[model samples]
Target chain A: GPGMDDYALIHKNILHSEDLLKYILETSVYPREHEQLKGLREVTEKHEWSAALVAADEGLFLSMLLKLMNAKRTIEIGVYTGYSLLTTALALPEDGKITAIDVNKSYFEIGLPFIQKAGVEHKINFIESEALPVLDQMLQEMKEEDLYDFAFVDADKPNYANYHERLVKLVRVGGAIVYDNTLWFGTVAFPEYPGLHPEEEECRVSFRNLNKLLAADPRVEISQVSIGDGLTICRRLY
Target chain B: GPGMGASQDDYALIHKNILHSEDLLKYILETSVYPREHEQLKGLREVTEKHEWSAALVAADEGLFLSMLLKLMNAKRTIEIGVYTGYSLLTTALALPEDGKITAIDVNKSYFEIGLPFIQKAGVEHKINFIESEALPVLDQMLQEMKEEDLYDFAFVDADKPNYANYHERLVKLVRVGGAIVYDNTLWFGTVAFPEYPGLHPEEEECRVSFRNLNKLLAADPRVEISQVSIGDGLTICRRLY
Candidate 1:
């Protein structure tokens, strides 16, 4: 639905230097990227909304994090060609389960073949619905044992704070809730950048507010790492 | 070295900002780190500031991440290769369960003495076993004396740059499968990408080469899964895969 130019501009400035990002990609990320993930990026990069996909380096980090935690039951608030979804599925064990919610299933269909090819499709239960209502339903119905081990939120920027409130409860104590794009292209740090889109600026404010809220949220210990866009890793505490 | 006060450059170099702006690094620290830092951690950080090599200490943000990681993995036994002012060692000690233990090794015990009072105040000094020596011999001894139950759940390495690959080899064997070994300063102030960019000390230039080689070696090593996180001069997290 959106072109890459606007999104590309955001990433272009997140890191200290473009060369450094390239060095990390070539050195650490590309060498370990899953074949299906590489294929997903190959196809998704051609789509109009390709920039919405999570960066490969971020994917590698999340994959390792999940395996480290031995995470089984997980949730994904945004699918976006299922690059990260596949990452979670592949990272999880055969018995692992994932509850993936995305408003439009069509974007997910773009990468279904890759997920199928990766052979982890059974781990995912893709729901084509807005995330909040489903999250609310899960909150009401889930048992303590049903609480997720991990969560990854890469959804609507304005609703991230909202997701945090729900996901913190949905994820078990000591579990992780990772939020993507928290830096909002480093706009949260600077007053403004040239040629900013009105929507982009609004999203930046939203993330800035969310970052402050997360900072003071006491229920979670946070590490706002400067990975792709910026991944604020929240470890839920009772 | 006589210290009147930390220089302006020292303050600027403290975090070694990898982000676009020093303000961005400061923003993350003040907003996310300082507000939640443990009382003793704050005390130790303040005490460390008077030291000439204070900049070598782990940044507050990375300490937060390591704390969370220890909790997430339920890490009980850990190893610390370099204990400058014991910032990261204290961070790990606080994160672990009350009964958990850490074997902390550093070449110079004097620097660790500066933070030992804070560690004792936090009441986590019991969790630490401080060793003053080069890490290799200790690691080798542990590997020789090790049993399955003695395997460490986590290891944090912030020592000599040239010896990291050596540490990685020994740490992987000493730490159990699924346990993590994190190497600090792997990014070398983002100099790995541009060695000749300038304004680097000769030693830093040499370490830059070592880090680049270390990254390549870890990337190809199938025994561990890695995430080269860009925090606190780059924390390369390697989860042993057996």
Candidate 2:
């Protein structure tokens, strides 16, 4: 009795998968051109579930949040291809400065052309070194000068706790710090599965610990979300 | 004439309709709580969603956004209506100065008591004044007191829907000329339409009317500059300039 079912009924209602897929595809193809970051939005759309890049919607939201906060001196612990970097840079004022630190200069170099082309390179201090030392130096500088207004920590996972300790000092009282990848592709819950990459497992553990540390620490207030592999935001209250 | 030709995807498609199956994904993700917030965030999300209060609480990014706004305005004294498990209240308390004060009002004392331990554990209890009472009367008392004292730097409205207008009227006077008032859930879950209630789904309809009316009132009021964001159902921020 199985004739050609043109209705494509899934349960009692006809399936609209084709229409839904078309709408999703259309939505996923649109590009956003906000000053320095053009076509960067596609990276997020194409890689929505697993995109290491921050989604364009989230990027715009963060940029506006930062701009409304009037963040002048900010720091990004990780600069992956400069998508978020560009977002933050564009949100800041013309004279605002962002101390961007990363261990991979080659990867940053790949995105430098785009950043320079975006015309906001003057507002950034791209440090080609590990984050710890740079953070240490920045903390030392804070003893004499004003501390950072905001910080985005998206670097190696194992060092998140360390990054928080140092960043808490570098970020002034009442400043904010955003920790990315706290969800680890949703693997944060399973028991240590054998065969998982050791580094990834290590990252998961570190993120878990950082989450606890922030929650327990009265020095800052925290909120964790399910956005983009998960983001944990902490604001230092003093 | 049916053959065993269904693929794995077909089986998954069929099984996805089960409520327990849908809950399994939520359970798995929910278990990934950070240690310190493990119990608190888990409990907050579970309770809020179960009680259908998820739309009322602001989003995580919106919390950060509000914290930044508090800092930018140099807000030292703050007030929060509807402490519902203290998610946003905790965030605002954390963004304030050590000497900053936050007056948190909630009608359900027992509910707030559940989250009090976490708040104290965070060590900002000294900065918070947890008041168990309806908001308007307490706000009225505060306003009368503020006439002889300095006004608050910030106020967050997230309480009973019907009293939002009353809250805003009091907040406008309690907050300084340049301070801000953040009104939560202004979108009312996309039910801002239908201006007057016809007695259908009275609760939701009432909420919608309140949201629309408040939006109109704020728009017409020339004393403040308003920005309505669509993040997390909607967050309407009014910066008093008069």
Candidate 3:
């Protein structure tokens, strides 16, 4: 009988096939993964909801992008185990700061010790609250110098559009805001299924609406990269 | 179906298919690529549609990526190998500043001529210096004639697969430190992972093996840092480190 040894069971695949995704991960990503990143993954693996972790390859991509942009001030909306937040903190300069928000502070606690071990914990400001209110408050009180250079949102799907409206204002022009899970596990391409669960159906619809709105929005220039359940990098043009 | 180029239905296909579904690919093109495409880019693609090697043209999404990258890097001097219908070349031209220069090389000039009208109409033709020659001699000649100030800010390699490693050796020295060299078709239509599959053309198989070797070589190479993005077919973006 198949068990934990099954590659398909342990890995998430959004590419043409699971094999293709595996080939890339094993070839290009795993070898270069930071030690603390591997540690974080190892520690977070037992959690039943570890699927919420950002894929390793996508974390590597974000690392490269942040380096390229020379991003300093940043934000992360979903700090699930802080894998991506750690990568972002590592990539930024010593002076970099990230305003990481998540509804569940417990999830942030899971990866907090690892972030401290990695010695990048000082770069993060973890806020335990719903993101919209925080974003709205920042929007009202932030000064010109407080504008962020980048943002990464992997939070609640339905609230993504709401986040975008505020993020576009928070991130500086030419800075980027990346939205995760835009493909919703490839369901965005499939026709409505009769057997779909309400929760799954709701996510798919929210993603569909968000993708269209992001595509049509004039404020940002976007590239919809099909990596890690679909990461859409939107560079604020205005 | 056994022809050299992709069939018409595979209009925007990136090497048979790069994503989980053709509909997903179409969704991206319609929602993101088409709406933002320059009018002449759309024209160039249409003119290229009738060519037997229309499949050789870069996908619309890839063009967007290239355009965005050039702006991000603030690249003024660039080079592109394998300029079929000049779609990527035109994309680069549009992305560059008005005074930016591009050295474009390809074996055939007639294919470039087909898209020349669109490029001319786009008002970016002056930015390009189209060279009707093989890439090896051109690259080697540039190395010989190179000066410190003449280093290219970026390079795009989409030519014959067999010479990719050779080009990498040359391009690392040609592109300035921190500059980028983007290699297209490194995934080789996902055939690299399963070379024994049925209907894999001899040329396709050869390209697959080359890319497999290239990916390993790039992974080991210390001169550049690479991010092999799963964009159109597979774009391996290598940024020179030293």
Candidate 4:
């Protein structure tokens, strides 16, 4: 064997198992999304921040969620190449809108063309900027609380808690906000997980604190489930 | 460890790493309810557990998810494709406003008979129209009645898997815009996820393919938005956007 594959098989994977996950994608991914997803991923995998793009399953999951929420006014905290941006756009109505933000606009160009091809570019208001200040501006400019129907936080792990503070106030009651990778990719790995190492990393510390905050917040009806990467769907109650 | 094989917990462990999970689920359940709901559901659970097809009962996580989603939708009208022991039905009833309605269906009244008193005791019978007939016809009749009005705000499908796509066909148009139609056990007991697993129950084998087929159909259909969640089994929540 000239090359041993990156193949590994186990009796089961903790989150639906790898076999289960494969089956979910096989059946759950819509037929129309095949080429679009592939085209987007093809471009992403070649870019500098390729690894940062969401996996297909999560994209499918997000697209599904955006429509399920009837999410018209939405926000994306992180827009690395806009895979999630496009997913939200695909699910929104023709007039449905998104206030998408990114730290750098150049990176988003990687997935912008495919998003245009998906014909949802018209729905997005992409801003090349950091997520924090944009969120702050929304907080200041808002005439009322809970103006957006949904918000997704995926940009900076350490700033998750920061992003959420504004989001909680910005999202409408009965609307939703999702914290992606909240599980830190099963980072609860016992004695030496990076998240536990405060001296070496703050992401793990930040995520752990954020999870605790969401749990006791009492402002949202929370159901944290493990799907693509980890998903915590918090529907605002206030 | 009793009847559970190692792989049986495949989907169960998916949340093992999360700070929020089954432990959190039990905590939320305890803090969020009336004692009476627990008293009634406890007995129903024990009785239903003895049935050979006991796993068909919807579990805690999905129950809580339904209630949360229903509450979010402010759903006053809904339907459940199956009424097996009423775990899910009760969940819907508890989440809805006082005057809410649920059209619950199942082929066998005997199964639902097991949970009817619980419904009565909880004072939710007023909300439920229990139909002791085949689900397909009931679905068809509802569609006929719904030709001009979109009354249901939420619908749950947990009956026979093979008929799910059939139910989805009627439900999508009937549920109002922003209404949700959720299908339970889309994961098919980790069976559909790993159809090759030899330990799958005979009944699981029977319905696994149907679940896979129905799930695909719902995904392909553009009438709804979806979130395939790994909770108890798999719950695919579809929000009707039209």
Best by TM-score: 1
What CA RMSD would you report for each candidate? 3.5, 12.1, 4.7, 6.9
lDDT of 1 by residue, B1-242 (tens): 56534343533334556776787887778877898899999999998887788778788989999898899889999999999899999999999999999999999999999999999999999999999999999999988899998899999999888899999989989999899999999987788887564655556667788999999999999999999988778889999988
Question: Could you give candidate 2's per-residue lDDT for residues A1-238 as a string of tens digits?
Answer: 7671122111111112233222212222123235446554444345422245654444544664575466898999888678889888887889999999988776566567777888888999999899999888776666636788889987888889899999888888878888877756555545453545566667767766766666678887665654335566677877
- Cα deviation at A83, candidate 3, in Å, is 1.3
Which scores greater on DockQ, model 2 or model 4? 4
Of models 1 and 3, which has the larger DockQ? 1
Give candidate 3 regions above 4 Å deviation: A1-11, B1-15
Give one digit per residue, the lDDT tens place, for model 4 in A77-111: 88888878887887788998898888888878877
**Residue B161's lDDT in candidate 3:** 82
Chain A TM-score per model, please list them.
Answer: 0.94, 0.80, 0.93, 0.85
Per-residue accuracy of model 1 over A118-225 as CA lDDT, tens digit each? 999999999999999999999889999899999999989899999998998999999999999987776787666666777787788888899889989989888888
**Model 2 chain B — which ten-residue stretch has the worst lDDT?**
B12-21
DockQ for the candidates, in order: 0.70, 0.08, 0.49, 0.21
Poorly placed runs, candidate 2 (over 4 Å): A1-35, A43-50, A109-118, A136-143, A190-199, A217-221, A236-238, B1-73, B77-155, B159-202, B205-242
Screening candidate 3 with a backbone cut-off below 3 angstroms (N, C-alpha, C), the clashing residue pairs are none
Query: Which candidate leads in lDDT?
Result: 1
Estimated TM-score for each candidate: 0.94, 0.57, 0.91, 0.79
**Model 4: per-residue Cα lDDT at residue A29:** 59
Ranking by lDDT: 1, 3, 4, 2
Deviating ranges (above 4 Å) for candidate 4:
A1-16, A189-201, B1-54, B107-125, B169-179, B193-201, B219-227, B238-242
Between 2 and 4, whose TM-score is larger? 4
